[PDB]
Design a protein around this motif. Structure first.
Motif, PDB file in Angstrom:
ATOM      1  N   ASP A 159       0.832  -1.197   0.000  1.00 19.97           N
ATOM      2  CA  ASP A 159       0.000   0.000   0.000  1.00 19.97           C
ATOM      3  C   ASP A 159       0.870   1.251   0.000  1.00 19.97           C
ATOM      4  O   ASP A 159       1.937   1.293   0.620  1.00 19.97           O
ATOM      5  CB  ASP A 159      -0.933   0.015   1.214  1.00 19.97           C
ATOM      6  CG  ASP A 159      -2.060  -1.011   1.103  1.00 19.97           C
ATOM      7  OD1 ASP A 159      -2.143  -1.704   0.056  1.00 19.97           O
ATOM      8  OD2 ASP A 159      -2.854  -1.123   2.072  1.00 19.97           O
ATOM      9  N   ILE A 160       0.411   2.271  -0.717  1.00 19.76           N
ATOM     10  CA  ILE A 160       1.109   3.547  -0.808  1.00 19.76           C
ATOM     11  C   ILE A 160       0.252   4.566  -0.091  1.00 19.76           C
ATOM     12  O   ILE A 160      -0.941   4.718  -0.386  1.00 19.76           O
ATOM     13  CB  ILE A 160       1.388   3.957  -2.260  1.00 19.76           C
ATOM     14  CG1 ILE A 160       2.334   2.928  -2.905  1.00 19.76           C
ATOM     15  CG2 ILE A 160       1.998   5.344  -2.303  1.00 19.76           C
ATOM     16  CD1 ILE A 160       2.490   3.100  -4.378  1.00 19.76           C
ATOM     17  N   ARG A 161       0.842   5.241   0.876  1.00 22.33           N
ATOM     18  CA  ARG A 161       0.113   6.220   1.656  1.00 22.33           C
ATOM     19  C   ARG A 161       0.730   7.585   1.395  1.00 22.33           C
ATOM     20  O   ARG A 161       1.907   7.693   1.034  1.00 22.33           O
ATOM     21  CB  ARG A 161       0.112   5.854   3.130  1.00 22.33           C
ATOM     22  CG  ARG A 161      -0.731   4.569   3.389  1.00 22.33           C
ATOM     23  CD  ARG A 161      -1.064   4.335   4.852  1.00 22.33           C
ATOM     24  NE  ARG A 161      -2.122   3.318   4.973  1.00 22.33           N
ATOM     25  CZ  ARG A 161      -3.412   3.589   5.219  1.00 22.33           C
ATOM     26  NH1 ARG A 161      -3.817   4.851   5.387  1.00 22.33           N
ATOM     27  NH2 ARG A 161      -4.310   2.594   5.300  1.00 22.33           N
ATOM     28  N   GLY A 162      -0.116   8.610   1.486  1.00 23.98           N
ATOM     29  CA  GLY A 162       0.257   9.979   1.176  1.00 23.98           C
ATOM     30  C   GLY A 162       0.294  10.878   2.397  1.00 23.98           C
ATOM     31  O   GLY A 162       0.955  10.538   3.387  1.00 23.98           O
ATOM     32  N   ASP A 163      -0.417  12.017   2.352  1.00 23.85           N
ATOM     33  CA  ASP A 163      -0.366  13.004   3.420  1.00 23.85           C
ATOM     34  C   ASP A 163      -0.806  12.426   4.753  1.00 23.85           C
ATOM     35  O   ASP A 163      -1.874  11.824   4.848  1.00 23.85           O
ATOM     36  CB  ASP A 163      -1.261  14.204   3.101  1.00 23.85           C
ATOM     37  CG  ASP A 163      -2.753  13.830   2.895  1.00 23.85           C
ATOM     38  OD1 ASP A 163      -3.078  13.152   1.902  1.00 23.85           O
ATOM     39  OD2 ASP A 163      -3.594  14.265   3.712  1.00 23.85           O
ATOM     40  N   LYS A 164       0.018  12.642   5.773  1.00 26.34           N
ATOM     41  CA  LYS A 164      -0.201  12.253   7.158  1.00 26.34           C
ATOM     42  C   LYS A 164      -0.753  13.462   7.906  1.00 26.34           C
ATOM     43  O   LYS A 164      -0.337  14.597   7.670  1.00 26.34           O
ATOM     44  CB  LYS A 164       1.107  11.833   7.837  1.00 26.34           C
ATOM     45  CG  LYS A 164       1.941  10.791   7.083  1.00 26.34           C
ATOM     46  CD  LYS A 164       3.337  10.602   7.733  1.00 26.34           C
ATOM     47  CE  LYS A 164       3.319   9.541   8.839  1.00 26.34           C
ATOM     48  N   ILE A 165      -1.675  13.226   8.809  1.00 27.49           N
ATOM     49  CA  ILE A 165      -2.164  14.394   9.531  1.00 27.49           C
ATOM     50  C   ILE A 165      -2.277  14.174  11.034  1.00 27.49           C
ATOM     51  O   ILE A 165      -2.299  13.053  11.547  1.00 27.49           O
ATOM     52  CB  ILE A 165      -3.501  14.894   8.928  1.00 27.49           C
ATOM     53  CG1 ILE A 165      -4.584  13.927   9.232  1.00 27.49           C
ATOM     54  CG2 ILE A 165      -3.412  15.071   7.409  1.00 27.49           C
ATOM     55  CD1 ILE A 165      -5.858  14.111   8.346  1.00 27.49           C
ATOM     56  N   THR A 166      -2.332  15.310  11.741  1.00 25.72           N
ATOM     57  CA  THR A 166      -2.681  15.360  13.148  1.00 25.72           C
ATOM     58  C   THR A 166      -3.429  16.667  13.363  1.00 25.72           C
ATOM     59  O   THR A 166      -3.138  17.682  12.733  1.00 25.72           O
ATOM     60  CB  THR A 166      -1.449  15.217  14.039  1.00 25.72           C
ATOM     61  OG1 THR A 166      -1.883  15.091  15.383  1.00 25.72           O
ATOM     62  CG2 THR A 166      -0.511  16.391  13.909  1.00 25.72           C
ATOM     63  N   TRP A 167      -4.456  16.598  14.177  1.00 27.81           N
ATOM     64  CA  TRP A 167      -5.229  17.756  14.595  1.00 27.81           C
ATOM     65  C   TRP A 167      -4.689  18.285  15.922  1.00 27.81           C
ATOM     66  O   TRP A 167      -4.564  17.535  16.893  1.00 27.81           O
ATOM     67  CB  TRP A 167      -6.691  17.366  14.770  1.00 27.81           C
ATOM     68  CG  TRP A 167      -7.398  17.121  13.514  1.00 27.81           C
ATOM     69  CD1 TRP A 167      -7.651  15.894  12.938  1.00 27.81           C
ATOM     70  CD2 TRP A 167      -7.938  18.112  12.611  1.00 27.81           C
ATOM     71  NE1 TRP A 167      -8.288  16.077  11.734  1.00 27.81           N
ATOM     72  CE2 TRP A 167      -8.508  17.419  11.530  1.00 27.81           C
ATOM     73  CE3 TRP A 167      -8.021  19.521  12.633  1.00 27.81           C
ATOM     74  CZ2 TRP A 167      -9.138  18.077  10.473  1.00 27.81           C
ATOM     75  CZ3 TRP A 167      -8.655  20.151  11.600  1.00 27.81           C
ATOM     76  CH2 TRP A 167      -9.215  19.434  10.539  1.00 27.81           C
TER      77      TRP A 167
END
Ligand SMILES: O=C(O)CCC(=O)Nc1cc2ccccc2cn1
Ligand SMILES: [Mn+2]
Length: 225
Positions: free
Chosen positions: A65-73
């Motif tokens: 699997d290829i994952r892109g933008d990582k986030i945290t609030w």
């Protein structure tokens, strides 16, 4: 691309006229090198200690699997996020000083901060509109933190496609740069593939009227009878 300054001067002489004319406004050197670097250090610490998600699923064997933008609030009050909170307070100061001058909007609130990390694996963000359906967000505010970013080598340009205009607005995610743009269909946009780690912090500001009638459409509960 205004040169940053007192929140009021920035708001009155640059942000307000530019937003009303173009709908897209860029302020460079918003907080200065020392504060910007402190923010960079905080975001990198969040990254290094595992506070981000694993990234948007781009390609779905799960091992490949290829994952892109990582986030945290981020609320801005968490331990180690103090300077992110200072950035958010500064964004809020600017918007307050724009009150009633940004279109016919009346801004009365915002989201938490959405901190994003593109890991530099060739992923970007596909063309989209932030608020296509009237959820209350009228202005997108993005602060970039990437020192000595060179888009010719690293990619990661934010390309905006202003409605009714045959042109691109290309914004490099440069250190200490602040970007404002209308969140609705006037400004579809995409992130071109990024080949180095790219960080950004986003807050969205709500228009009181649109948000009040989104609540009705959205309908999160409810008073018991
Ligand atoms: O980093 C930038 O230059 C902005 C890229 C961008 O559009 N990010 C973005 C990220 C989002 C994440 C969750 C929901 C909506 C979202 C809308 N836009
Ligand atoms: Mn977006």
């Amino acid at each position: 691309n205004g040169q940053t300054l007192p929140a009021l001067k920035l708001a009155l002489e640059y942000i307000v006229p530019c937003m009303n004319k173009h709908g897209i406004c860029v302020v460079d050197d918003f907080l200065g090198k020392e504060t910007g670097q402190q923010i960079g250090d905080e975001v990198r610490a969040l990254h290094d200690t595992g506070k981000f998600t694993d990234g948007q699923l781009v390609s779905q064997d799960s091992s490949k699997d290829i994952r892109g933008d990582k986030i945290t609030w981020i609320e801005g009050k968490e331990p180690g996020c103090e300077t992110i909170g200072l950035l958010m307070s500064s964004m809020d100061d600017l918007i307050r000083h724009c009150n009633g001058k940004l279109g016919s909007y009346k801004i009365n609130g915002r989201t938490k901060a959405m901190v994003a990390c593109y890991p530099g694996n060739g992923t970007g963000y596909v063309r989209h509109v932030d608020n296509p359906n009237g959820d209350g967000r009228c202005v997108t505010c993005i602060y970039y933190l990437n020192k000595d970013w060179d888009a010719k080598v690293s990619g990661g340009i934010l390309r905006i496609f202003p409605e009714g205009k045959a042109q691109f607005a290309d914004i490099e995610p440069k250190f200490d740069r602040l970007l404002f743009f209308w969140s609705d269909r006037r400004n579809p946009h995409e992130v071109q593939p990024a080949y180095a780690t790219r960080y950004a912090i986003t807050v969205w500001y709500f228009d009181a009227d649109e948000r009040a009638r989104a609540k009705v459409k959205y309908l999160t509960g409810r008073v018991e009878l």
